[PDB]
């Protein structure tokens, strides 16, 4: 199967699978059950914004998910890397939806891999920012039910004609170019990634949330990843 | 045929299509006949570079060819290229061999797009930089002769094992993702390229050059576009 | 006297010195009378944005305002700043009100310098960016009438409590660093600046405008440069 | 007293005050002894490099020392530098000498802080790099014997005109403008910073080290910080 590290914003607790009883934050590596995850008030209809953070020094997986008011929730995992993805990934933004239902519209997304030193600080490096999406966004690989539209907006699972977010969507939107995300001469591989995020629902509850994930480069959406497994694995394990 | 907009360094002076009569580093518009062109002093086995800069509201395609004795060449031309290129391009480097050879050997290679707007910071941005190329560099598009090595460079037109310069070599490096190189709405959209150079040669004359181009994003190598041609164009019109 | 080169966004035509008879958008090299004018449609109480470009290749002094329901003027001008600056400037943003007034309110400001040299991706660089102004901004040097507010903004002319510009103010900010802005070394000497303002006025006429200007490291606003002197210039010469 | 969170480049172990038996790099938090030390093979003569690199989300200094050869030390000290720092700070560089010596020669210097979210991913940052320092470098304030000469760096103690490092030197570096380190509305407070060096002596032993540090914007070199002060602290408490 694909090689995921994911951080999820995880508005719907399937607490059978392991999930916290309440929307939260999570790092994910290798499985849908989160390695940490603090609790997350999603506020619905408000645009978020998600950072995610890494370097190889601090070895340290981090993420933070806040909203305009100020409310936030931090997550942080210490993992090395280096040990759990490939050299080259893509990376990308993956939602779903189950059951119950929201909309998992990215407002934008920044992504910025580095590899430093050996030397100087000379390095390799990839950064890419979407502000704005367009219809036909060329730099994005579009997977199931993600799409762009003229709003400017990635609905990465399924909206109706009028705005109402469907249910059992699944998608995703991958960077187009590989990242080489670590080298191990490297003396630090970071990355970092920003989205922002309007989660709406008028369902009783929400679900089932946005992740930003690093994947194998061929990675596609696991065949039944609707709904808690986020379009990120073929299952719960 | 594909569009070209590229920033040529001619070593060698094909006087017969409209190369003055020396090397040069040039812009070129859809023809290897550049629009303009500046006296260069290639400067044999010594790395140069290569600065490129353009923004849509100076409308000024510039280029600086540089080594680390103090020369240096530019090279400006006036030109909207939201009038040439299209909105989604393939951004690379090229170089060919002929009759006379010399290696084409970049050692590193940046690059950023802009896409700012009617707001504030909110930009649209592709930024890349290789510092180090391996052997697999999974988001570069090799074509024709390229490789790269573990010598962490790439080597634009075919090097012998024994390190020299093959002839009738023609080679190309794209970025892997398209570049959105102009969007309507934008108030500015600028791009930049830097790369560094050794062109070294023990031939009666070097040939042909570098080009960093700027492409429709399936360009291919055209055929027979050895030697003058750069690997850019199909004839020298 | 200072030396000072700007980016005027006039909003006072003072046909008597020069200004074209409608607001504009311009050019000063050591002098209110710019070299260089477009036509601009200053939107009363609307967020606009500039952007000003300039590197030492291409040696094009760029500037583009627009606003958000897409209206855009732009200026660009001719020029080797190496000749008209000292090497150390410090940059800065400069607003005046005379008999007529109006907000001269900054939102965000960024500005990027960059040497760029003989080498590869060594550069010296200062970037910086506020998108937010504190109380007190410690990186800012305020002069004349120019505050930092809680609402996050720049206020380069008076404002009153209730919220009314004032007529014959004038203020900068500079930001605290000198900037090397040229150094004969560097092959490469680029800047840009964008800013985001809202100019407001229930004036018969809005006056005056904002400049982004770089100066002497030693500038301070001559004395009685409100008006259409844009707190600039000693005199309209 | 100043307030200083520094990294230090530790080159002689000072054991009675708390240093381990060995060349190491460490974090210090307001004491010169460091919260948290690695081991470092200072490698005479080499240009090494080092990171460095905070962020408010996973709370940890990290930093990394490393040489062409490829060897490295890193260490990484957890702490939320929001309660350790004042708002406002300068950043520098420093170094000393004390009975031994060495040259403490900084080639390069980069200084990324930036302030995000409370929205959007707009932000408040400063980033500055020196690739080559200048002999009259006016936006670096240099404290004590630091110095910059033609050659490009930064020489932070005493080096007679022989070359040869001088005893009982102390010098630092500090970039001219404050830095806006964090601010609680900020859900990012990241910086990082990196520098070169070269460390050599013909003493014995090399002494004493060299630190990136944060300090209060008013911190000047407490009197008696030559040799295992480090330029840093009034005193080992
Ligand atoms: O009754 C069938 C199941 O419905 C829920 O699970 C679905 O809906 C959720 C969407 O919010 C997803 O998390 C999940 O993957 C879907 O299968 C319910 O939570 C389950 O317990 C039920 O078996
Ligand atoms: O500087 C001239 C160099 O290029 C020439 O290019 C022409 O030669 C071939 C004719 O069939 C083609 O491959 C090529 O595309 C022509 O335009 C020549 O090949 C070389 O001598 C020179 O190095
Ligand atoms: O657009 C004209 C505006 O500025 C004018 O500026 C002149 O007025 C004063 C004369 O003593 C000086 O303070 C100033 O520097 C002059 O150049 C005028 O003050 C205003 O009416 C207009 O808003
Ligand atoms: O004999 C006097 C002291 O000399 C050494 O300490 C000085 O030299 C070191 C430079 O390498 C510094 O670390 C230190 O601050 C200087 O005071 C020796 O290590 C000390 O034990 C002696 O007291
Ligand atoms: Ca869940
Ligand atoms: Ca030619
Ligand atoms: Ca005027
Ligand atoms: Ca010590
Ligand atoms: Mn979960
Ligand atoms: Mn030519
Ligand atoms: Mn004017
Ligand atoms: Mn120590």
Redesign the interface.
């Known amino acids: 199967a694909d090689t995921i590290v994911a951080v999820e914003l995880d508005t719907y607790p399937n607490t059978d699978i392991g999930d916290p009883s309440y929307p939260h934050i999570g790092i994910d590596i290798k499985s849908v059950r989160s390695k940490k995850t603090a609790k997350w008030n999603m506020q619905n209809g408000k ?1 978020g ?1 998600a ?1 995610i ?1 890494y ?1 190889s ?8 998910v ?1 909203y ?1 008011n ?1 409310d ?1 929730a ?1 997550v ?1 995992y210490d993992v090395d890397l280096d040990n759990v993805l490939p050299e ?1 990934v893509r990376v990308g933004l993956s939602a779903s939806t189950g059951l119950y239902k929201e909309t998992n519209t990215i ?2 997304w ?1 992504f910025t891999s580095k590899l ?17 999406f ?1 219809k036909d966004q ?2 994005l690989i579009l997977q199931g039910d993600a799409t762009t539209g003229t709003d400017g907006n990635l609905e990465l699972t399924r909206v109706s004609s009028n705005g109402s977010p469907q249910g059992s969507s699944v998608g995703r939107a991958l ?6 995300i670590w ?1 191990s ?1 490297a ?2 591989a ?1 990355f970092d990634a ?1 989205f ?1 995020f309007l989660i709406k629902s008028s369902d009783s509850h929400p679900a089932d949330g946005i992740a930003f994930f690093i994947s194998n ?1 061929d990675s596609s959406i696991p065949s039944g990843s609707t709904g808690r497994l986020l379009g990120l694995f073929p299952d719960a394990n």
């Open positions: 645009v914004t950072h953070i370097n020094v601090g070895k340290r997986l981090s993420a933070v806040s305009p100020g936030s931090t942080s080259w407002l934008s920044s430093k030193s050996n030397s100087t600080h000379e390095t390799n490096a990839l950064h890419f920012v979407f502000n704005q367009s060329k730099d960077f187009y170019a590989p990242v080489h080298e001469s003396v630090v970071s920003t922002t480069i």
